Design a protein around this ligand. Structure first.
Ligand SMILES: NCCc1c[nH]c2ccc(O)cc12
Ligand SMILES: NCCc1c[nH]c2ccc(O)cc12
Lengths: 212, 212
C-alpha cells in the first residue's frame, strides 16, 4: 500500500521523536491485564512466575493525521520501536521480564496507541498455603519507573483482571484477580508516583482436566 | 517383699485366667488419649504418624482382694502379660503399632486396672493443606477388634484429648483434638461395635522455636 508507506514516512522521518511527558504536558496511560497462566511457584525463594498480556493505551498529538490525506487510512500496525512507549515497570520482579510476543503497536489517526505485549515475569510472592482450599494471595505493582504522577497518570478501564484466556489446565486456579490504581512514594523522591496494584488470589487446581 | 509376693501368687498361680467378657458378663473399658507428637506426614501415601499414650481402664471381679489379708496392700504394679487386657485396636492403621514404653499395669484391690502404653502409629490420613492456616483434619477410630457392644462397651472420661504433654517444638501444632464414643457396624457382622473416634485438627507449626 502506497498510502501507508507515505503515512509512515511522514510520521517517522521528518521530526524528532516525542521526548516523553512533562509537567506541562502530562500523559495518562490506561492499563489492563489479561492473566494467562500462573506457571510456577518456588517455595524455597518465594518467587512466583506469571504469564500475562499487558494492555497499554495512550495518545500523542504528534501521532495524529488526517485520513483524507492518506487514502482514508484510520489506523496502522507498526513496530513499537518506531514510537515512544511508556516505561511501565513491575516493581517486585526478581528476574528480567521475558517477552513472548511481537512488539508491534496499533496507532490510530487521532494519535491513540494500543500496545499489548505478552510477558513472563518472576516476582516476589510467598506461595505457602497454595495447596489448600483458602489458597494464597500475592500482589504486584506496575507503574512508571522514572515519571511521577505529574508526568504520567495511570488508569484502568475495569478493576477486574481479564481471565477469559486463563489456561484451564494450569497447575493453579484463580480465585480472584483485581487491578487497582494506587498512589506510592519511594525513598529517593518526595513526589507522588502512580501505580496499578495487581492482586491475585490462587490455589493448586484440583478440579478439571487431569481430574476425575 | 513378702505380702506382695503372697498376693501375686494367690491372684495368678491358682486359677484359669479370665476368658474375656461375654454377653452374660460384659465389660466397659474407659479410654483416654495423651497426644504427644505428630511426628511425620507422608503426602505420597496419605499416612501420618502419631505418638500418644493410650490410657485404658477396666475392672475384673477376679482381680479383687481384701487388703487386710495382704498387709494393707491396696494396689500393685505388674507386667501386663500377667493379666487379661482388652483388644483395643486402631482401625485405620497402616503399619503394626510400635510400643515405646514398658507394658506394666497398676491393679487396685477392687479389681480395677490402669494400663497406659506409649505407642507410635502410622494411620490413614490425607495431609494435603497441612501447611496452611486452616490445616487439616484426620480421624482414627479405636475399639475392640473382635468383641461387639454386647461384650465390650467403651467410654471416655472426657471428650478432650490430653495435650498437656504435647511436644512444643513438633513440626506440627494441634488446633484441636477430641475423643468421642461412637457406634459402628462392619460388613462381617450384624452386631454394633463400639469405638472411640480420635479426631485431630493440625497444621505445620509456623511459630515458636526455629521461627523468626
Ligand atoms: N494477540 C492478542 C492481542 C492483540 C490483538 N491485537 C493487537 C494489536 C497490537 C498488540 O500489541 C496486541 C494485540
Ligand atoms: N508414665 C506415664 C503413664 C503412667 C503413669 N503411671 C502409670 C502406671 C501404669 C502404666 O501402664 C502407665 C503409667
Amino acid at each position: 500500500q502506497a498510502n501507508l508507506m507515505r503515512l509512515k514516512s511522514d510520521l517517522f522521518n521528518r521530526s524528532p521523536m516525542y521526548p516523553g511527558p512533562t509537567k506541562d504536558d502530562p500523559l495518562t496511560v490506561t492499563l489492563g491485564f489479561t492473566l494467562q497462566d500462573i506457571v510456577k511457584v518456588d517455595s524455597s525463594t518465594n518467587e512466583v512466575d506469571l504469564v500475562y498480556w499487558e494492555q497499554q493505551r495512550w495518545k500523542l498529538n504528534s501521532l495524529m493525521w488526517d485520513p483524507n490525506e492518506y487514502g482514508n487510512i484510520t489506523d496502522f500496525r507498526t513496530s513499537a520501536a518506531d514510537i515512544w512507549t511508556p516505561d511501565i515497570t513491575a516493581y517486585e520482579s526478581t528476574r528480567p521480564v521475558q517477552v513472548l510476543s511481537p512488539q508491534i503497536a496499533v496507532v490510530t489517526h487521532d494519535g491513540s496507541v494500543m500496545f499489548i505485549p505478552a510477558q513472563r515475569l518472576s516476582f516476589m510472592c510467598d506461595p505457602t498455603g497454595v495447596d489448600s482450599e483458602e489458597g494464597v494471595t500475592c500482589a504486584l505493582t506496575f507503574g512508571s519507573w522514572v515519571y511521577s504522577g505529574f508526568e504520567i497518570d495511570l488508569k484502568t478501564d475495569t478493576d477486574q483482571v481479564d481471565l477469559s484466556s486463563y489456561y484451564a489446565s494450569s497447575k493453579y486456579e484463580i480465585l480472584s484477580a483485581t487491578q487497582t490504581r494506587q498512589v506510592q512514594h519511594y525513598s529517593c523522591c518526595p513526589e507522588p508516583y502512580i501505580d496499578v496494584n495487581l492482586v491475585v488470589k490462587f490455589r493448586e487446581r484440583r478440579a478439571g482436566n487431569g481430574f476425575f
